[PDB]
């Protein structure tokens, strides 16, 4: 039928050594930390970004600011 009128993102589905240690080291020093910011800065899955946000907030390297269904704002602890 006649039709009238974006390269793919390869995001790491599971962690690796370099990206994981970089998450531990660098990210907790970002002003705004969010699923999208983590995924774009580390080339990592969005679900891994949620997992990372949860783990880092749990063990104290990041503090929540406004967490919700929409943008889950975290920030650098201090």
């Amino acid at each position: 039928k006649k039709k009238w009128s974006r390269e793919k993102l390869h995001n790491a589905v599971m962690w690796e050594k370099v990206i994981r240690d970089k998450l531990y080291s660098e990210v907790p020093k970002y002003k705004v930390i969010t699923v999208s910011v983590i995924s774009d800065r580390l080339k990592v899955n969005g679900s891994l970004a949620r997992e990372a946000l949860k783990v880092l907030h749990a063990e104290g390297l990041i503090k929540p600011v406004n967490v919700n269904a929409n943008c889950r704002l975290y920030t650098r602890a201090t």
């Binding site: 039928k1 599971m14 690796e16 998450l23 783990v55």
Partner: protein, 146 residues
């Protein structure tokens, strides 16, 4: 936590003759197998003692073995019979989950059985029309302007 990926992480496995993706979760990589679907997939992931949380690449040989066992003969693994794909199977009378190209093999068998005899539905199938009573006036158009 933040587990890494193992070195044996298979990007694409093969679960009873279908290339499944290792990057999807397990219960949604399994839905690549024709005939398993995303409810039976989750049920066999729960019956196979396999965590729904991990990706499919991390699945090992014993995982996929005890998982194809369920996918192949599920009624021995407490999956009920109302859950199955062939629920009475004329010509056999047995209840089974047709999976991984026996789905369309059984579809071809059921169309052959209905076209051998001149059942109206088999006739519709062979003429390439819309069985089960639709209106073929303005919907199945399929291009071909005249």
């Amino acid at each position: 936590s933040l587990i890494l990926q193992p070195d044996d992480f298979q990007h694409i496995l093969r679960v009873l003759n279908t290339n499944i993706d290792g990057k999807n979760k397990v219960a949604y990589a399994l839905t690549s197998i024709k005939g398993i679907g995303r409810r039976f997939a989750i049920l066999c992931c729960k019956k196979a003692d396999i965590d729904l949380n991990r990706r499919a690449g991390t699945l090992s040989n014993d995982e996929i073995a005890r998982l194809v066992a369920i996918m192949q003969n599920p009624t021995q693994f407490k999956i009920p019979e109302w859950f199955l794909n062939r629920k009475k199977d004329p010509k056999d009378g047995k209840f089974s989950q047709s999976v991984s190209n026996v789905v369309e093999q059984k579809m071809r068998d059921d169309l052959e059985k209905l076209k051998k005899v001149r059942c109206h539905r088999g006739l519709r199938h062979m003429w390439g029309l819309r069985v089960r009573g639709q209106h073929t006036k303005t919907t199945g158009r399929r291009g071909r302007t005249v």
